[PDB]
Coordinates of C-alpha atoms in Angstrom, one line a residue:
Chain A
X1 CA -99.7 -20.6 30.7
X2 CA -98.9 -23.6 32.7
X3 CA -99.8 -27.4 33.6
X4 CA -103.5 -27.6 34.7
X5 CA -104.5 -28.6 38.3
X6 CA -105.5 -32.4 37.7
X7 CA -104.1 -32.4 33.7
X8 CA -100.6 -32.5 32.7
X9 CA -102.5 -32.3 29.0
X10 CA -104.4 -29.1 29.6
X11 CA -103.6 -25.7 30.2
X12 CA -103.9 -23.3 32.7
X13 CA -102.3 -19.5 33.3
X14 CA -100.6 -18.5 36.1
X15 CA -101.6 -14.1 36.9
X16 CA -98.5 -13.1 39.7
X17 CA -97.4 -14.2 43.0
X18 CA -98.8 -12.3 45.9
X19 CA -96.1 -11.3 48.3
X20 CA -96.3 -11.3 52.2
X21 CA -93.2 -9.0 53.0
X22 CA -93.6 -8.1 57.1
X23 CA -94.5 -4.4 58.4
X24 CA -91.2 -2.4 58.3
X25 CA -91.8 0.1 60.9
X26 CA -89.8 3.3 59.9
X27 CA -91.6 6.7 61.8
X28 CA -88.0 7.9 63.4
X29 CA -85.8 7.3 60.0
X30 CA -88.2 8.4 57.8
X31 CA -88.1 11.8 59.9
X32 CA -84.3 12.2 59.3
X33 CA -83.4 13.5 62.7
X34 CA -80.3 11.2 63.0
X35 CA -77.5 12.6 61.1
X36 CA -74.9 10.2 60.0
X37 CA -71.1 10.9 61.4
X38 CA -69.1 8.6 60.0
X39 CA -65.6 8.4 61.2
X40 CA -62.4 6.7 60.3
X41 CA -62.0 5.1 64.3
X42 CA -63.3 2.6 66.3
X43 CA -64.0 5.2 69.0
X44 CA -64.5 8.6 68.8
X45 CA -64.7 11.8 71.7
X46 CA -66.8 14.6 72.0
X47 CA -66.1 18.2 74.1
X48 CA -68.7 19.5 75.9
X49 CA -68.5 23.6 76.3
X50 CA -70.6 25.2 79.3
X51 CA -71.8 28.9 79.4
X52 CA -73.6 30.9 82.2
X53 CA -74.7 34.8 81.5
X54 CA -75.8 36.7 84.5
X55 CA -77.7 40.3 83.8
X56 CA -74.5 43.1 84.4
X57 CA -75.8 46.0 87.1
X58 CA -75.9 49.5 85.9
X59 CA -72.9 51.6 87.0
X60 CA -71.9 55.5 87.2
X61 CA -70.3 56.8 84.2
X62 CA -67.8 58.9 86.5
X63 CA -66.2 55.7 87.9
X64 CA -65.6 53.1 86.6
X65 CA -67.8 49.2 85.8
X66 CA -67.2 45.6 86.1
X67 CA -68.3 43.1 84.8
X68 CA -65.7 40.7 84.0
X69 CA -68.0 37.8 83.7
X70 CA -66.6 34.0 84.5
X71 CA -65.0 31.6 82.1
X72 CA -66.4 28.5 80.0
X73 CA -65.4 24.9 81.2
X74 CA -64.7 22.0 79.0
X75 CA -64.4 18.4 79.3
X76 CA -64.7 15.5 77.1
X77 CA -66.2 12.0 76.9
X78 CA -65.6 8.9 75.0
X79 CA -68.0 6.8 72.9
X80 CA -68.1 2.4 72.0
X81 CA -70.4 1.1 69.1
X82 CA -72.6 -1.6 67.8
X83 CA -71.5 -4.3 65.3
X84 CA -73.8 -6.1 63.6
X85 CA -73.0 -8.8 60.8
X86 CA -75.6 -11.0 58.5
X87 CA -73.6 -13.9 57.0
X88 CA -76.0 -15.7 53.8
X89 CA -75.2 -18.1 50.7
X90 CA -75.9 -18.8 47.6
X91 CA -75.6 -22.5 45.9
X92 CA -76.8 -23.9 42.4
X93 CA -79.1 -26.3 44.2
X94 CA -81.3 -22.7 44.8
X95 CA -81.4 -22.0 40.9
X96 CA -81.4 -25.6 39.1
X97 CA -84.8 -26.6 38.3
X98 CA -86.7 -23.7 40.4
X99 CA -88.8 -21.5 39.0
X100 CA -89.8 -17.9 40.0
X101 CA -92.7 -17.8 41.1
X102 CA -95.3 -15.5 39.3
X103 CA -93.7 -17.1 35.9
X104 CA -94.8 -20.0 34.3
X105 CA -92.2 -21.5 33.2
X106 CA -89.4 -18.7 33.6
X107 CA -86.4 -20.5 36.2
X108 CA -84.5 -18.4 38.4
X109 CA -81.4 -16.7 37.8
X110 CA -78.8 -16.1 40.3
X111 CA -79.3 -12.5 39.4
X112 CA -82.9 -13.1 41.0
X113 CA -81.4 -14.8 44.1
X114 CA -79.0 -12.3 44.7
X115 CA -81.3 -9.3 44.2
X116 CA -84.2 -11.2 46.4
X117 CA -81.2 -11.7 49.5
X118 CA -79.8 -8.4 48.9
X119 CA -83.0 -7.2 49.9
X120 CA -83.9 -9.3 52.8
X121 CA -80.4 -8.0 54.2
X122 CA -81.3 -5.0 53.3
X123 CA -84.8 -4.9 55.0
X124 CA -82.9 -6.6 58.2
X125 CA -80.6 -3.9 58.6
X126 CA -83.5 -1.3 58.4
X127 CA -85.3 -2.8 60.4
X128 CA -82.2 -3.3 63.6
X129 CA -81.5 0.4 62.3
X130 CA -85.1 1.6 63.0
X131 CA -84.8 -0.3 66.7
X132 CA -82.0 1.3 67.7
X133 CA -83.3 5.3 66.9
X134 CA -85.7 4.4 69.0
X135 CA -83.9 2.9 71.8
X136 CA -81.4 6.0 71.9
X137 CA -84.4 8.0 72.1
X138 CA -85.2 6.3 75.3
X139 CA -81.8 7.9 76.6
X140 CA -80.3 4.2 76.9
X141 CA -79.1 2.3 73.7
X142 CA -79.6 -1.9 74.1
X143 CA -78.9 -4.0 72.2
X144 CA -81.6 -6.6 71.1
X145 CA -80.4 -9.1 72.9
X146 CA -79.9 -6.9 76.1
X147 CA -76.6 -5.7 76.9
X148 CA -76.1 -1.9 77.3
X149 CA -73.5 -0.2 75.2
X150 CA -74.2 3.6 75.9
X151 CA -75.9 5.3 79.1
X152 CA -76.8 8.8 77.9
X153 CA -77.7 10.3 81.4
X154 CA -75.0 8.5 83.3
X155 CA -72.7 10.2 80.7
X156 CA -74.0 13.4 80.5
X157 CA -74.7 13.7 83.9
X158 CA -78.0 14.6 83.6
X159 CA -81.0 13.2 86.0
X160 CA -83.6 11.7 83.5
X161 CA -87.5 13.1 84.2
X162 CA -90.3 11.0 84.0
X163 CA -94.5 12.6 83.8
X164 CA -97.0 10.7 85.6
X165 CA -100.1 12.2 83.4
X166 CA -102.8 9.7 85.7
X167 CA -105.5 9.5 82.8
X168 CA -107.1 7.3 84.6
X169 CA -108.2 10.0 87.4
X170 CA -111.2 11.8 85.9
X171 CA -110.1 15.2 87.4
X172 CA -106.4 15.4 86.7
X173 CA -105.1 18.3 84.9
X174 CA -103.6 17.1 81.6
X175 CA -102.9 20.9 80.9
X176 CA -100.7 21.4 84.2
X177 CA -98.8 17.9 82.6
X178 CA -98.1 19.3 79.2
X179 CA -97.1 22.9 80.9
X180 CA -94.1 20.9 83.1
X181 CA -92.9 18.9 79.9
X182 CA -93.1 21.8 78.0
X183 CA -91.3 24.4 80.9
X184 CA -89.2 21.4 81.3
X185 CA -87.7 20.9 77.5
X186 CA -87.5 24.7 77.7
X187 CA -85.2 25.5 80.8
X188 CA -82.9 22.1 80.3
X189 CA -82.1 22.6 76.6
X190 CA -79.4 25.3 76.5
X191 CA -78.6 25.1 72.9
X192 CA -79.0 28.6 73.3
X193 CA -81.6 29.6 70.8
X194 CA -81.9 27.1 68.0
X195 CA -84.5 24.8 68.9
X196 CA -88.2 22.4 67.9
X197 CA -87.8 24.0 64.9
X198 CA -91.2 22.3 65.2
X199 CA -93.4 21.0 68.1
X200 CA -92.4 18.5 70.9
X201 CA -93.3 15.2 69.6
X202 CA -94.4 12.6 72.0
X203 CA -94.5 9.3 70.5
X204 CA -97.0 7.0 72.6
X205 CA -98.4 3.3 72.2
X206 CA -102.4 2.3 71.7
X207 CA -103.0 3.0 75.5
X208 CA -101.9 5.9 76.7
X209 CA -103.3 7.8 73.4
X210 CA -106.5 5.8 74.4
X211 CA -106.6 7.0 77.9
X212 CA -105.7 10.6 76.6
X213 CA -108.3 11.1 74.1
X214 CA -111.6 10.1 75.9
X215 CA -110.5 12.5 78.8
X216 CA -113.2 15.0 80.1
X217 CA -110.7 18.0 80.3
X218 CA -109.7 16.7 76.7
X219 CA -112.2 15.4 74.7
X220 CA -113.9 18.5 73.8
X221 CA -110.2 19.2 71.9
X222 CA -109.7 15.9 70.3
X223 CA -113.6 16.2 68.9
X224 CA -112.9 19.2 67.4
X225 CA -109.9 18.0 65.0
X226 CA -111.9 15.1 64.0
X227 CA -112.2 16.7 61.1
X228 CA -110.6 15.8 57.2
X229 CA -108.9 19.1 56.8
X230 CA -107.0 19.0 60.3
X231 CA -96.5 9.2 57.4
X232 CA -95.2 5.8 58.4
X233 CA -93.4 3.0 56.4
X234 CA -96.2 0.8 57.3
X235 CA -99.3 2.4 59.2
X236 CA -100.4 5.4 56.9
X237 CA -102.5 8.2 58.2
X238 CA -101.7 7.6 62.1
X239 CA -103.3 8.6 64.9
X240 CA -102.1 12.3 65.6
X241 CA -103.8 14.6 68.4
X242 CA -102.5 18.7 68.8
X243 CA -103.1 20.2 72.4
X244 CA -101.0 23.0 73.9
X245 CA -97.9 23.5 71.1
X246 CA -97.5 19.8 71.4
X247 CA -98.2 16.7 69.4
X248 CA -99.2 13.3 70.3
X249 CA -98.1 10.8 67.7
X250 CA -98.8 7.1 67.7
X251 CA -96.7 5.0 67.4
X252 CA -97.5 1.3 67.3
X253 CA -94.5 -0.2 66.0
X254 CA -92.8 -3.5 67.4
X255 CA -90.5 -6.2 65.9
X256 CA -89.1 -10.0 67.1
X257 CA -86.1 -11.0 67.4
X258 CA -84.2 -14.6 67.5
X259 CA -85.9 -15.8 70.5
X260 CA -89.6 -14.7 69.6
X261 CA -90.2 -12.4 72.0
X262 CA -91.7 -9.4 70.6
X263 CA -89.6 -5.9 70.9
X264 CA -92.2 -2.8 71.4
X265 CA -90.6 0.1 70.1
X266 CA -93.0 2.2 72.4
X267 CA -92.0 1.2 76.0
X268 CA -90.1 2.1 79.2
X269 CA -88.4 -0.3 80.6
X270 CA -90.3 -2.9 83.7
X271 CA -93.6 -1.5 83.2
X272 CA -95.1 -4.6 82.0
X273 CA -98.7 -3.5 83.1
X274 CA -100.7 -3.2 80.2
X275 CA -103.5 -1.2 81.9
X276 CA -100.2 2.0 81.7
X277 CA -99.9 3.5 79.0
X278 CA -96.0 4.6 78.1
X279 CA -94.3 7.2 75.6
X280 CA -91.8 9.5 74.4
X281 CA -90.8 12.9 74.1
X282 CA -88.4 14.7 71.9
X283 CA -87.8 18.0 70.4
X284 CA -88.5 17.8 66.4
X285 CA -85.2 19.3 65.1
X286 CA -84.9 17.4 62.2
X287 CA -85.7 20.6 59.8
X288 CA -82.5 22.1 61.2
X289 CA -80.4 20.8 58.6
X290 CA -76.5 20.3 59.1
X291 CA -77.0 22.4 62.4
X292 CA -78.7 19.1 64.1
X293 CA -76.0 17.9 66.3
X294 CA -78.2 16.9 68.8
X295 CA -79.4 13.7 67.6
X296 CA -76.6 11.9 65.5
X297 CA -75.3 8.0 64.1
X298 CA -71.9 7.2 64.1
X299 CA -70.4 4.7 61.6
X300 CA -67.1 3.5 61.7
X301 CA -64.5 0.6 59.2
X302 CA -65.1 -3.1 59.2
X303 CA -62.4 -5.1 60.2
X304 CA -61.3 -6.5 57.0
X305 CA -58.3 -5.5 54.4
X306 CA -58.1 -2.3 52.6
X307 CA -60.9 -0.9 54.9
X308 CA -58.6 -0.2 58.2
X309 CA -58.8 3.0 59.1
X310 CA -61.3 4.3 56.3
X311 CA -64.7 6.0 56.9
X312 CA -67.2 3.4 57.6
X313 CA -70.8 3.4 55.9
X314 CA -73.8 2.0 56.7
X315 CA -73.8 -1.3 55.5
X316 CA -70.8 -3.2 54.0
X317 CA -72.1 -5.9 51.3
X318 CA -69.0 -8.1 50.6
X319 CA -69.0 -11.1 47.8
X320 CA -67.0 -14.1 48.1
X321 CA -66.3 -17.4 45.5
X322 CA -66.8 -20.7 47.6
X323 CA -64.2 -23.2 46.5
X324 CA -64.3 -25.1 43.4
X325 CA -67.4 -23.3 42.0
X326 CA -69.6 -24.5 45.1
X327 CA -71.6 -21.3 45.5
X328 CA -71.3 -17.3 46.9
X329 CA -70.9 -16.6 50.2
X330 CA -72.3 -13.1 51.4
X331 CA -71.5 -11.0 54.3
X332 CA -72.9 -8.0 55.6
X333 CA -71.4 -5.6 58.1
X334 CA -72.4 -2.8 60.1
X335 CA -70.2 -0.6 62.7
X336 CA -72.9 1.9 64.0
X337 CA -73.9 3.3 67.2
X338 CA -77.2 6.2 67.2
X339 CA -76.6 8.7 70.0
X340 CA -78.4 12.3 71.0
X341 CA -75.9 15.0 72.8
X342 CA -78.8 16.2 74.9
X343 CA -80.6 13.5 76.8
X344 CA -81.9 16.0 79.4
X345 CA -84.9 16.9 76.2
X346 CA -85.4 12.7 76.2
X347 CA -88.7 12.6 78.7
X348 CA -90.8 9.8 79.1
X349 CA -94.4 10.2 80.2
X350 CA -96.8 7.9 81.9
X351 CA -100.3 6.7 81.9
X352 CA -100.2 6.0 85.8
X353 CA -99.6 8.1 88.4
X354 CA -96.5 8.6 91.0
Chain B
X1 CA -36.5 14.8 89.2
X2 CA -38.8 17.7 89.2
X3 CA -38.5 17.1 85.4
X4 CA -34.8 15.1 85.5
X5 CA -36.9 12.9 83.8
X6 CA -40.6 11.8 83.1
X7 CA -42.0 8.3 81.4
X8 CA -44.9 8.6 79.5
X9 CA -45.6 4.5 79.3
X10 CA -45.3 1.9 77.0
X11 CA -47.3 0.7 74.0
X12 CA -49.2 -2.6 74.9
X13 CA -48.7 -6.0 72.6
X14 CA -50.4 -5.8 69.3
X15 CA -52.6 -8.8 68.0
X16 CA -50.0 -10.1 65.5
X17 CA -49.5 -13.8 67.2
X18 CA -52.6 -15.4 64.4
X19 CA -50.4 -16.8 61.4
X20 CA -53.0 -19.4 60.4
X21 CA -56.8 -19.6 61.7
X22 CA -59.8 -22.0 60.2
X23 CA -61.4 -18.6 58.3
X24 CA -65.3 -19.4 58.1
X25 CA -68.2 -16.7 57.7
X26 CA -68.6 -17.1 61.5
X27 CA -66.5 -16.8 64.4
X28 CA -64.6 -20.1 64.0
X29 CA -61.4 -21.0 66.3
X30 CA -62.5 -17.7 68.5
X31 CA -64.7 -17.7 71.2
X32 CA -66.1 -14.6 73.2
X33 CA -65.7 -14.9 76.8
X34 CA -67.1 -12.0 79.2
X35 CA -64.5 -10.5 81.3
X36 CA -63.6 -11.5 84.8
X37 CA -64.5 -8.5 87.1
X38 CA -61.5 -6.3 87.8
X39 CA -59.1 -8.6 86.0
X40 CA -57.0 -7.1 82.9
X41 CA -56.3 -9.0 80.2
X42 CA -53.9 -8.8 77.0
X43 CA -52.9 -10.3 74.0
X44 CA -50.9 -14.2 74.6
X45 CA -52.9 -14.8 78.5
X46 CA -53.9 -18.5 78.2
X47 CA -57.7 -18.0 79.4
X48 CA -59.9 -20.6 81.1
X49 CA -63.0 -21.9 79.8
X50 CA -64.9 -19.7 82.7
X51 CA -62.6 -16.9 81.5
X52 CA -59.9 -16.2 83.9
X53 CA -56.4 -16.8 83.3
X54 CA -54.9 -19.7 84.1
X55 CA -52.8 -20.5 87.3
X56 CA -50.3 -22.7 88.5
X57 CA -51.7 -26.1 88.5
X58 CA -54.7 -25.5 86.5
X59 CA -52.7 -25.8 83.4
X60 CA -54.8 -29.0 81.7
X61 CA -57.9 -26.7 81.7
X62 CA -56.5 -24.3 79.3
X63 CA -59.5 -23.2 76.9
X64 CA -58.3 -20.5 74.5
X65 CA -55.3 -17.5 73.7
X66 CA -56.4 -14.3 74.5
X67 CA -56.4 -11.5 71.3
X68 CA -57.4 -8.6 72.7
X69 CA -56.2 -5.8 75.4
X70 CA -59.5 -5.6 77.9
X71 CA -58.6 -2.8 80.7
X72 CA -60.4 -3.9 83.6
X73 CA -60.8 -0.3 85.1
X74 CA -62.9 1.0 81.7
X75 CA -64.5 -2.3 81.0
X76 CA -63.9 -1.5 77.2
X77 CA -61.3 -2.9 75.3
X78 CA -58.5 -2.0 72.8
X79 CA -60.9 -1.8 69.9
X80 CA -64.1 -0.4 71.9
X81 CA -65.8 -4.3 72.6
X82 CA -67.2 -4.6 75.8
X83 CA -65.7 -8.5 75.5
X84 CA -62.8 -10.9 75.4
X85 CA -61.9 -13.1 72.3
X86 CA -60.0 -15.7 72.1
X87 CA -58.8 -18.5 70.0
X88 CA -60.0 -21.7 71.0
X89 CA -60.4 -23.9 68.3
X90 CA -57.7 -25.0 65.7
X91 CA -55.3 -22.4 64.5
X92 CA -51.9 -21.1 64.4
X93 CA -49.9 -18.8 66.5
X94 CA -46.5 -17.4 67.3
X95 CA -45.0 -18.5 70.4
X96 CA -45.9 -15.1 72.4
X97 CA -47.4 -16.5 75.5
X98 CA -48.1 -14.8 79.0
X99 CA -48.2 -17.6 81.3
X100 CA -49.3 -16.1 85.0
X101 CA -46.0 -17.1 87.1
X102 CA -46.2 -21.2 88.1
X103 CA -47.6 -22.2 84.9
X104 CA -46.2 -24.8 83.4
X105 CA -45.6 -24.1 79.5
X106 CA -45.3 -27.4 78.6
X107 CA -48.8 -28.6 80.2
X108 CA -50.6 -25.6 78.3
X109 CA -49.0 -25.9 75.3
X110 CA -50.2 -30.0 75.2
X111 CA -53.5 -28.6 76.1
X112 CA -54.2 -26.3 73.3
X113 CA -52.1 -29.3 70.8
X114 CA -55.0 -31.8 72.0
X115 CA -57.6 -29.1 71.3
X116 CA -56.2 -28.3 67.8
X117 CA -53.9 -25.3 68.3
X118 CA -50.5 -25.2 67.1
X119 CA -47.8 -22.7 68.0
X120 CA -45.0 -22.1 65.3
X121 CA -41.1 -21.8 66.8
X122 CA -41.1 -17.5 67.5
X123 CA -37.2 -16.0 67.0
X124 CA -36.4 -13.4 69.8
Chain C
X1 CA -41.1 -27.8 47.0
X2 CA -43.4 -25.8 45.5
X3 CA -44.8 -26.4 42.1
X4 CA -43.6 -24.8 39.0
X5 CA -40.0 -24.9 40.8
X6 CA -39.6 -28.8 40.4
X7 CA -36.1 -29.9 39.4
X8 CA -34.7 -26.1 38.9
X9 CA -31.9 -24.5 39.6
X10 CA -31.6 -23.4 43.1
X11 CA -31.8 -19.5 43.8
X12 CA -30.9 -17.6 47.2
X13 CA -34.0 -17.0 48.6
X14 CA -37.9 -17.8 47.6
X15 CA -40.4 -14.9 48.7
X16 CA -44.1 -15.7 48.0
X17 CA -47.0 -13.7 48.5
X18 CA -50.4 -15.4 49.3
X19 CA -53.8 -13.4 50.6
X20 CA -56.0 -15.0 53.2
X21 CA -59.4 -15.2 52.1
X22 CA -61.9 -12.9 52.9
X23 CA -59.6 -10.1 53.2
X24 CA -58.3 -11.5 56.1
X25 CA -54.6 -10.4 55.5
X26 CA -51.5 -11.3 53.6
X27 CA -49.3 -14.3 54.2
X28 CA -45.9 -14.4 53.6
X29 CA -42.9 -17.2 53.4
X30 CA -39.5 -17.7 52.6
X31 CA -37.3 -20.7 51.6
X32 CA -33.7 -21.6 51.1
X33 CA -32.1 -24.9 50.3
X34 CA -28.6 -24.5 51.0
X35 CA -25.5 -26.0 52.4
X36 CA -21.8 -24.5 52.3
X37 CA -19.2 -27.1 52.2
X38 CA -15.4 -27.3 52.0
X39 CA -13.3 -30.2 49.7
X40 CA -10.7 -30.5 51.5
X41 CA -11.6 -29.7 55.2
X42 CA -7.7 -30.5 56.3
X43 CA -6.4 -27.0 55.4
X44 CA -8.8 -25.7 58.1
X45 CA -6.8 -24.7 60.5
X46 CA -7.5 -24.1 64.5
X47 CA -5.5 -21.7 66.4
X48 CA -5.2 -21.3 70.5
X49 CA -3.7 -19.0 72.5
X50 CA -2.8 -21.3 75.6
X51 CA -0.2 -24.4 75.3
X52 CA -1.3 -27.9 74.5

C-alpha cells in the first residue's frame, strides 16, 4: 500500500520488484573438475615422475634372464598466480531516506546493503572464477585484460594438437576425426590406467555444433536422439549430441569486461572468422574424487596482517570503519591461479580445414 | 679449494624501507611499472618514470623507490608478480637507497621531496 | 608530547604501539627527554700524556 500514481490522497499497492540479475555462466564449476590446493606460499613446485615398460623376452630356465629394466627421471617446475581484488563502500547517504524496493514503505537497512554488495562481489568473483577454468582449459591461462601468467605446453613440454573437422566439406569423414582425438587422448595420457572416468567432453560454440549436426555422414545420428528419453547455471537443458564414446556439449557462454568487449568463453585464439566454428576437448575426470590431480586451483594468503604465511581461500571479505563514522569500506581478495598437469589431453578442434 | 671452501650466496634486501605510506583501498603512493628487458631490479633503485633506473645526470627525473626484487633472467619477482612496484607518490622511507654509481643523492632525494616523498635519517 | 603525559613526571624511555590501518602492519616509537648535567663542572678534570 503506497501513494497512488497522480494522488498523494489515494492508495495504491505495490506486488515485488522484478530483478534483472545477468546470466552467470557456470558449466566448468558446476562439473567440479578443479580441485582446490590451497597452499601457505606465494609459489608453489610440482615433480614430474616418468616411466617407460618394455615387454621382457622369454629366456631358458638353465641360464640365466635379464631384464633389469631402466630408471624413472624426475624434474620439477615452478608455478605464479592471479590476484584479483574488488574494493566497494558503504555510506549513510545509501540508507537515509531509501526505500527497498518491492516494499512500500519499508527503508533499507545497512544489513540490506551489505547483503545486496556481498553478493554482487560474490557473483563477480564467480563469474572471473568461471573465465579462468575455461581459459586453463585452453592450455594457456590469460588474464582478462591479456597478459599471460601460465603456458601449460611451453611448461610441460608438450606440442599442443589441433583437429581440423572441415564440416563444411560434404564428404569429410567426421568418424576418421573423432577416431584421431579419441587415439590421441588415449596414447598421450599416461596416467597409467585411471582415466574419462566418463566420456571426452568437447565443449563447442553455436557454429561448429551447427555445422556438425546437419552433416550427411551425421545427421542420420543426431535424428535419432531427438528423442525425450535420450545442466548449466544459466542455459538449462543444452544442446548435447553422443557419437563414437564422445560427447558434444554446447557451450554458449561469454562475459564483458571493463572495456566492453565481450570475452567468449568458447574460442581459440585469432580465429575471428565467424563462418569457423571452435571448441574444446577434455577428459571428464571429475567423478575421480581426491585422485583428480589432473585438473587443479591453487589458492594462496593475502598480503595483509595475521594472514602471512597462512593457507589462502577463495575469497577474502575484509570490513573496515571509515573515520569518524563516515561509512564501511569493503575489500575483497583473491590469490588463485587454475592449472591442469596434463595439457597434452587439452585439444582444440576446428570447423575449418588445414 | 676442491671443497677448502664453498659460498652458497647471500640473502637479497627485504622490503622493510616503508615507515609511513598514504594507505587507501587502492594502490596509492605505488605505482606498477613493467620491467626493463634484462634489467634486475631490487628493493631502494630509484626508478624512472619509463622504468629504468636512474643514471648519472638523469637524477631530476626520478619517478618512484623500487619495493620489490624483479630477477631479470626469470621475469618473475620475489613474491611471484610478473611486475615492478614502486612508491611514487607521498610516503615515508628509511634512508636505504641504491643509487647506480654517478648519481647524485642530493638531486634524487629533492626530487622525490618535491613529489611528496620523505626519507627519515636511517642509523648504520 | 603526547597526550595523557602532559606535565608528568619524566620516565626513561616511552614505547608506544600503534597498528596501521587495514592490517597494514604495526608501528612503533620511542621517546626520551633527557639531559645529564654536572653543578660544578670545575672538578672535571683533563688528563694528557704529552707536556704542555
Amino acid at each position: 500500500l503506497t501513494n497512488s500514481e497522480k494522488s498523494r490522497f489515494f492508495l495504491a499497492d505495490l506486488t515485488g520488484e522484478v530483478q534483472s540479475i545477468p546470466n552467470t555462466y557456470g558449466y566448468i564449476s558446476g562439473l567440479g573438475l578443479f580441485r582446490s590446493a590451497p597452499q601457505t606460499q606465494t609459489t608453489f613446485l610440482m615433480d614430474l615422475t616418468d616411466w617407460d615398460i618394455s615387454l621382457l623376452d622369454a629366456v631358458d630356465r638353465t641360464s640365466r634372464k635379464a631384464e633389469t629394466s631402466a630408471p624413472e627421471r624426475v624434474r620439477q617446475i615452478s608455478f605464479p598466480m592471479m590476484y584479483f581484488k574488488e574494493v566497494e563502500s558503504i555510506t549513510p547517504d545509501e540508507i537515509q531516506g531509501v526505500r527497498q524496493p518491492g516494499t512500500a514503505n519499508e527503508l533499507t537497512t545497512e544489513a540490506v546493503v551489505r547483503a545486496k554488495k556481498l553478493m554482487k562481489i560474490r557473483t563477480k568473483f564467480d563469474i572471473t572464477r568461471e573465465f579462468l577454468f575455461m581459459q586453463a582449459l585452453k592450455g594457456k591461462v590469460i588474464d582478462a585484460n591479456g597478459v599471460l601468467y601460465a603456458d601449460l605446453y611451453k611448461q610441460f613440454d608438450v606440442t599442443k594438437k589441433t583437429i581440423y573437422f572441415d564440416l563444411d566439406n560434404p564428404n569429410s569423414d567426421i568418424d576418421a576425426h573423432i577416431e584421431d582425438l579419441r587415439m590421441h587422448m588415449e596414447d598421450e595420457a599416461k596416467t597409467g590406467t585411471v582415466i574419462n572416468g566418463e566420456e571426452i567432453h568437447i565443449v563447442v560454440d553455436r557454429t561448429f555444433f551447427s555445422k556438425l549436426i546437419k552433416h550427411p555422414k551425421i545427421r542420420d545420428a543426431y535424428l535419432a536422439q531427438q528423442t525425450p528419453l535420450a545442466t548449466d547455471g544459466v542455459q538449462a537443458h543444452m544442446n548435447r549430441f553422443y557419437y563414437g564414446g564422445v560427447v558434444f556439449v554446447q557451450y554458449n557462454g561469454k562475459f564483458k569486461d571493463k572495456r566492453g568487449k565481450t570475452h567468449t568463453l568458447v574460442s581459440i585464439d585469432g580465429v575471428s572468422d565467424t563462418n569457423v566454428g571452435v571448441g574444446h576437448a577434455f577428459p571428464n575426470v571429475a567423478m575421480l574424487g581426491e585422485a583428480n590431480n589432473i585438473f587443479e586451483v591453487a589458492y594462496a594468503p593475502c598480503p595483509k596482517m595475521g594472514y602471512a604465511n597462512t593457507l589462502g581461500q577463495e575469497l577474502y571479505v575484509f570490513e573496515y570503519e571509515k573515520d569518524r563514522d563516515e561509512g564501511i569500506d569493503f575489500e575483497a581478495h583473491s590469490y588463485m591461479l587454475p592449472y591442469c598437469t596434463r595439457p597434452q589431453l587439452l585439444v582444440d578442434v576446428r570447423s575449418d580445414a588445414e | 679449494a676442491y671443497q677448502g671452501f664453498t659460498k652458497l650466496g647471500e640473502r637479497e634486501p627485504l622490503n622493510d624501507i616503508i615507515l609511513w605510506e598514504e594507505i587507501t583501498p587502492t594502490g596509492h603512493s605505488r605505482k606498477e611499472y613493467a620491467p626493463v628487458a634484462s634489467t634486475e631490479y631490487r628493493v631502494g633503485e630509484v626508478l624512472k618514470a619509463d622504468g629504468s633506473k636512474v643514471a648519472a645526470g638523469q637524477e631530476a627525473q626520478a619517478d618512484s623507490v623500487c619495493i620489490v626484487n624483479f630477477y631479470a633472467d626469470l621475469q618473475l619477482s620475489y613474491h611471484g608478480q610478473l611486475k615492478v612496484v614502486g612508491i611514487y607518490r607521498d610516503a615515508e622511507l628509511k634512508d636505504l637507497l641504491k643509487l647506480e654509481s654517478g648519481v647524485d643523492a642530493a638531486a634524487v632525494k629533492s626530487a622525490l621531496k618535491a613529489k611528496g616523498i620523505d626519507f627519515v635519517p636511517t642509523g648504520l
